[PDB]
Design an enzyme around this catalytic site. Sequence first.
Site, PDB file in Angstrom:
ATOM      1  N   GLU A 159      -3.684  -4.615   9.840  1.00 26.27           N
ATOM      2  CA  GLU A 159      -4.247  -5.625   8.913  1.00 26.27           C
ATOM      3  C   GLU A 159      -5.661  -6.027   9.257  1.00 26.27           C
ATOM      4  O   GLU A 159      -6.429  -6.234   8.326  1.00 26.27           O
ATOM      5  CB  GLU A 159      -3.324  -6.830   8.880  1.00 26.27           C
ATOM      6  CG  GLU A 159      -1.922  -6.500   8.378  1.00 26.27           C
ATOM      7  CD  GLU A 159      -1.939  -5.701   7.121  1.00 26.27           C
ATOM      8  OE1 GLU A 159      -2.809  -5.989   6.285  1.00 26.27           O
ATOM      9  OE2 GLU A 159      -1.136  -4.747   7.004  1.00 26.27           O
ATOM     10  N   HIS A 198      -8.029  -4.378  -0.694  1.00 25.15           N
ATOM     11  CA  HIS A 198      -7.231  -4.377   0.499  1.00 25.15           C
ATOM     12  C   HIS A 198      -6.218  -3.210   0.450  1.00 25.15           C
ATOM     13  O   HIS A 198      -6.138  -2.455   1.447  1.00 25.15           O
ATOM     14  CB  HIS A 198      -6.484  -5.745   0.588  1.00 25.15           C
ATOM     15  CG  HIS A 198      -5.670  -5.883   1.839  1.00 25.15           C
ATOM     16  ND1 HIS A 198      -6.141  -6.508   2.976  1.00 25.15           N
ATOM     17  CD2 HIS A 198      -4.391  -5.492   2.146  1.00 25.15           C
ATOM     18  CE1 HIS A 198      -5.202  -6.475   3.930  1.00 25.15           C
ATOM     19  NE2 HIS A 198      -4.132  -5.845   3.450  1.00 25.15           N
ATOM     20  N   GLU A 199      -5.445  -3.091  -0.597  1.00 20.98           N
ATOM     21  CA  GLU A 199      -4.465  -1.953  -0.645  1.00 20.98           C
ATOM     22  C   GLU A 199      -5.171  -0.651  -0.653  1.00 20.98           C
ATOM     23  O   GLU A 199      -4.669   0.269   0.066  1.00 20.98           O
ATOM     24  CB  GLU A 199      -3.577  -2.113  -1.855  1.00 20.98           C
ATOM     25  CG  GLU A 199      -2.867  -3.439  -2.017  1.00 20.98           C
ATOM     26  CD  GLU A 199      -2.201  -4.005  -0.797  1.00 20.98           C
ATOM     27  OE1 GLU A 199      -1.688  -3.244   0.045  1.00 20.98           O
ATOM     28  OE2 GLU A 199      -2.116  -5.257  -0.689  1.00 20.98           O
ATOM     29  N   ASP A 201      10.328 -10.667   9.309  1.00 21.63           N
ATOM     30  CA  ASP A 201      10.015 -11.496   8.140  1.00 21.63           C
ATOM     31  C   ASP A 201       9.809 -12.971   8.475  1.00 21.63           C
ATOM     32  O   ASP A 201       9.132 -13.647   7.700  1.00 21.63           O
ATOM     33  CB  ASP A 201      11.109 -11.331   7.105  1.00 21.63           C
ATOM     34  CG  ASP A 201      11.079  -9.966   6.451  1.00 21.63           C
ATOM     35  OD1 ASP A 201       9.958  -9.399   6.313  1.00 21.63           O
ATOM     36  OD2 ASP A 201      12.161  -9.480   6.077  1.00 21.63           O
ATOM     37  N   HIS A 259      -5.960   0.371   2.969  1.00 18.65           N
ATOM     38  CA  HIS A 259      -4.818   0.863   3.770  1.00 18.65           C
ATOM     39  C   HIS A 259      -4.648   2.394   3.662  1.00 18.65           C
ATOM     40  O   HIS A 259      -3.938   2.936   4.509  1.00 18.65           O
ATOM     41  CB  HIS A 259      -3.518   0.211   3.319  1.00 18.65           C
ATOM     42  CG  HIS A 259      -3.238  -1.121   3.964  1.00 18.65           C
ATOM     43  ND1 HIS A 259      -3.217  -1.258   5.327  1.00 18.65           N
ATOM     44  CD2 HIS A 259      -2.919  -2.350   3.466  1.00 18.65           C
ATOM     45  CE1 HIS A 259      -2.924  -2.526   5.647  1.00 18.65           C
ATOM     46  NE2 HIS A 259      -2.690  -3.217   4.537  1.00 18.65           N
ATOM     47  N   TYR A 319      -3.771 -10.799   9.961  1.00 13.88           N
ATOM     48  CA  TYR A 319      -4.859 -10.503   9.035  1.00 13.88           C
ATOM     49  C   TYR A 319      -6.166 -11.114   9.520  1.00 13.88           C
ATOM     50  O   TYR A 319      -7.194 -10.466   9.605  1.00 13.88           O
ATOM     51  CB  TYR A 319      -4.535 -11.045   7.646  1.00 13.88           C
ATOM     52  CG  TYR A 319      -3.376 -10.369   6.981  1.00 13.88           C
ATOM     53  CD1 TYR A 319      -2.067 -10.668   7.318  1.00 13.88           C
ATOM     54  CD2 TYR A 319      -3.609  -9.438   5.981  1.00 13.88           C
ATOM     55  CE1 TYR A 319      -0.967 -10.021   6.713  1.00 13.88           C
ATOM     56  CE2 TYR A 319      -2.556  -8.797   5.338  1.00 13.88           C
ATOM     57  CZ  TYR A 319      -1.237  -9.050   5.757  1.00 13.88           C
ATOM     58  OH  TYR A 319      -0.214  -8.372   5.155  1.00 13.88           O
ATOM     59  N   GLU A 346       0.794  -1.214   0.000  1.00 18.30           N
ATOM     60  CA  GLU A 346       0.000   0.000   0.000  1.00 18.30           C
ATOM     61  C   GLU A 346       0.863   1.320   0.000  1.00 18.30           C
ATOM     62  O   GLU A 346       0.517   2.291   0.701  1.00 18.30           O
ATOM     63  CB  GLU A 346      -0.873  -0.003   1.230  1.00 18.30           C
ATOM     64  CG  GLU A 346      -0.145   0.008   2.604  1.00 18.30           C
ATOM     65  CD  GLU A 346       0.236  -1.280   3.220  1.00 18.30           C
ATOM     66  OE1 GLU A 346       0.359  -1.263   4.491  1.00 18.30           O
ATOM     67  OE2 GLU A 346       0.389  -2.310   2.503  1.00 18.30           O
TER      68      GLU A 346
HETATM   69  C1  LIG Z   1       3.650  -6.328   1.716  1.00 15.03           C
HETATM   70  N1  LIG Z   1       3.229  -6.187   3.118  1.00 15.03           N
HETATM   71  C2  LIG Z   1       3.901  -7.089   4.055  1.00 15.03           C
HETATM   72  C3  LIG Z   1       5.412  -6.847   4.151  1.00 15.03           C
HETATM   73  C4  LIG Z   1       5.929  -7.457   5.445  1.00 15.03           C
HETATM   74  O1  LIG Z   1       5.419  -6.720   6.528  1.00 15.03           O
HETATM   75  C5  LIG Z   1       5.535  -7.153   7.798  1.00 15.03           C
HETATM   76  C6  LIG Z   1       4.896  -6.416   8.809  1.00 15.03           C
HETATM   77  C7  LIG Z   1       4.989  -6.803  10.138  1.00 15.03           C
HETATM   78  C8  LIG Z   1       5.701  -7.938  10.429  1.00 15.03           C
HETATM   79  C9  LIG Z   1       5.828  -8.393  11.884  1.00 15.03           C
HETATM   80  C10 LIG Z   1       4.612  -9.137  12.407  1.00 15.03           C
HETATM   81  C11 LIG Z   1       4.385 -10.416  11.869  1.00 15.03           C
HETATM   82  C12 LIG Z   1       3.291 -11.184  12.343  1.00 15.03           C
HETATM   83  C13 LIG Z   1       2.412 -10.675  13.288  1.00 15.03           C
HETATM   84  C14 LIG Z   1       2.641  -9.405  13.802  1.00 15.03           C
HETATM   85  C15 LIG Z   1       3.728  -8.672  13.351  1.00 15.03           C
HETATM   86  C16 LIG Z   1       6.359  -8.643   9.429  1.00 15.03           C
HETATM   87  C17 LIG Z   1       6.320  -8.271   8.107  1.00 15.03           C
HETATM   88  C18 LIG Z   1       1.780  -6.394   3.314  1.00 15.03           C
HETATM   89  C19 LIG Z   1       0.954  -5.395   2.499  1.00 15.03           C
HETATM   90  C20 LIG Z   1      -0.500  -5.415   2.906  1.00 15.03           C
HETATM   91  O2  LIG Z   1      -0.890  -5.987   3.941  1.00 15.03           O
HETATM   92  O3  LIG Z   1      -1.339  -4.800   2.220  1.00 15.03           O
HETATM   93 ZN   LIG Z   2      -2.553  -5.177   4.496  1.00 18.61          ZN
END
Ligand SMILES: CN(CCCOc1ccc(Cc2ccccc2)cc1)CCC(=O)O
Ligand SMILES: [Zn+2]
Length: 608
Positions: free
Chosen positions: A316, A293-294, A373, A297, A381, A269
Site C-alpha cells: 500500500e 490507486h488500483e 479484517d 497495484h 497506506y 486491484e
Molecule cells: C480491498 N483491499 C483491502 C481488502 C482487505 O485487505 C487486507 C489486507 C491486509 C490486512 C492485514 C493488515 C492490516 C493492517 C496493517 C497491516 C496488515 C487486512 C486486510 C484494498 C484494495 C487496495 O488497497 O487497493
Molecule cells: Zn491498495
Amino acid sequence: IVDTCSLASPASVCRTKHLHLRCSVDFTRRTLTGTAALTVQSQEDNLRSLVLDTKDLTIEKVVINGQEVKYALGERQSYKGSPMEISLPIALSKNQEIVIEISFETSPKSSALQWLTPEQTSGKEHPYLFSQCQAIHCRAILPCQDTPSVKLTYTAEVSVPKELVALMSAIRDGETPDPEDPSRKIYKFIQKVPIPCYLIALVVGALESRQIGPRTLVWSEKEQVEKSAYEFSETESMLKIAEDLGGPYVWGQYDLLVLPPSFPYGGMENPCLTFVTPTLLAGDKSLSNVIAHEISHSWTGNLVTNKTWDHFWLNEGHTVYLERHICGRLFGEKFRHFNALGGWGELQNSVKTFGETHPFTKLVVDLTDIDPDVAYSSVPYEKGFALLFYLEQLLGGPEIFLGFLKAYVEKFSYKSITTDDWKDFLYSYFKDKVDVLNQVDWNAWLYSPGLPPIKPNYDMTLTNACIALSQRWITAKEDDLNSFNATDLKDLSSHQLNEFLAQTLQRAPLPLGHIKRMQEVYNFNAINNSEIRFRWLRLCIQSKWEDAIPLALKMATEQGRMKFTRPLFKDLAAFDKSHDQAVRTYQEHKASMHPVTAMLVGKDLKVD
Ligand SMILES: CN(CCCOc1ccc(Cc2ccccc2)cc1)CCC(=O)O
Ligand SMILES: [Zn+2]
Ligand SMILES: [Cl-]
Ligand SMILES: [Cl-]
Ligand SMILES: [Yb+3]
Ligand SMILES: [Yb+3]
Ligand SMILES: [Yb+3]
Ligand SMILES: [Yb+3]
Ligand SMILES: [Yb+3]
Ligand SMILES: [Yb+3]
Ligand SMILES: [Yb+3]
C-alpha cells in the site's frame, strides 16, 4: 519467515504453480460447486503429505492419479478456517509436480462471497454474486495455499444461468452453452501471469460493457454504464503515466467493474478487472484517485507482492506513492502535496482512533492470532506513504526517488518480498547516499506504534484556504455566524470542501447552532459526492443534530463501503438519540449485508 495467517504448507515445503477451476454457480443454493485442480511442485525430498487452507468448504473427494486419496480436515481455528491434510499416494522428489483435483462446494456463508437477490441489484430481475478474497478469504471459495508467498497461474470454466455474465481476474477465453444444462452458459478465463491467490476474483450478474480506452472496458449493470464510462474516462491517461513510472503493463487489458453498492471497499486491484464501489460515481470524476490507486497495484502489489500480510505496507505505501504521482502529473505538484498532507491527516485520525501505543499503528504489524479484517486501516497506506515521501525528500526529490521505484518493481517482479528485502534493495540502489539512509530511525518508522518520528515537508498552497475556513468556524461565537455565506465556498474545489470538512471533523463536536448555520449557508445536504457527504454527516451526528439521523442511517445502509458504513454506524450508536435505532437498523439489515461488513459493524456496535 512465517505466514501466521495460513494453516497450509509453506512455500518452503511445496508450491502451487497452477489452478484449473471448473465450477458452477448455484443461485438457488447460494453455493459454488466444482473442482479445483492444483498443480503442486514439491520443494522437499520424500514429500508425502501437504496441507491446504479451507474455510466453510464441504469436500467431496480428492483425486490424484485418477484415484481417490485420503484427506483429513482438522479442527476449525476461528477466522483461519480448517486445515486440510492430503496424504499423497506416492512420495514426491524435490521439484516434482503433480495435479491434485479437489471436488468441493462453498457454504452460503462464505466470507469471500456476497450473494445478492434481484431486489438488491439495479435491474431487479436477476441475482448477482461477487467475490473479495483479499486478505485471507480465497480459502472460503476453494482449497488453496492461502498465502501471498505463493504465486500461480490459473484457468477457469464457470457455468452460470444463461441470462448472466461471469467475469474473473483473467482474460476472457470464450463462452458457450453448457452441454450439461442448456439453461446455462460456460464462460472461460485464463490468467497467464502468476499471481497470489488473494487476486482470484469472480463476479456473475446481468452485466453490460462499454469501451472507454484502447485497453479498457467498463462493466456494470445497464443502469450504471453511461455514468461509469464518463466517471472513469481518465483511466487510459492514468495507465499511460503509470506505465511510464512503473515499466511495462503486463496484464493485457485493464478493465473496470462497478459493483453494487454493498461492495465493502473503494476498489480492489484484481488483475485485468479492477472492482470499484459505485460511491465513486460523483458525476465529475473527482474521486478518480481510487482508479489511480488500483491501476498502480498492477506494479506494486500484483507484480511485486508482500510475502506475508505483516508486510502489507509494502503493497500500500508504494501504491499510494505512485497514485499520488499520477495525480501530480495530471493536476500538478501542488495537488500532489495537497493529497499527501491530507493523507497525514487521515493517519492522525487512525492513530487517535486506535490509540498511539496500539500495535495496529505499527507499519510492520504482527498478525499472530489477529484476524486481518480487524486490523485493516489507513495506517499501512498513510504511514507507508509518509515513509516513502520522507525518503523522497531526504534522497534528492521525486525524480530520483521515482528511479528507485521503477528499479524496485523491476528487481522484484513476479516475486513476494518482505520489509527487509525492500530495505536491503533501498540501500543497494542508494549506496552512494547510505549516510543519509543511516540517518533514518528505522526501528521507530517500521516497528514503533503511533505517528512517525518525523513529519515530511508539505506544500500548503491548496490547503491553506481549507484550514482558514475551518478555523473561522471553530473559533466563531454565536455573533459571528451571520458572517458566513455561500460565497465562502466560491473558490474551493470539491477536494478542498472535503478537506475543510475533514479539518473541522478533527475538532468535532462543534456547537449545534454552528452546524445548523453551515447547512443554511452552504447547503451541504445537497452534495451527493460520497466523501463530502460522509464527512458532513459525521460532523452533524457528532454535533448532535437530530435532523441528520435519518440521512446518516440512509447513507450507512444504502451503500456498504466500510470506510463510510462503519464510522456512520459507530457515530449513530454514540449519539444517544440515534443509538437504539442504529442497533435495530443493523439487526434488520444484518442478514443481507456483506459477511465481512456484517461482522465488523457488529463488533463496532458491540452487538452479537
Ligand atoms: C480491498 N483491499 C483491502 C481488502 C482487505 O485487505 C487486507 C489486507 C491486509 C490486512 C492485514 C493488515 C492490516 C493492517 C496493517 C497491516 C496488515 C487486512 C486486510 C484494498 C484494495 C487496495 O488497497 O487497493
Ligand atoms: Zn491498495
Ligand atoms: Cl472451516
Ligand atoms: Cl449552539
Ligand atoms: Yb467415491
Ligand atoms: Yb482463446
Ligand atoms: Yb458441468
Ligand atoms: Yb543482501
Ligand atoms: Yb545489502
Ligand atoms: Yb463576538
Ligand atoms: Yb428500515
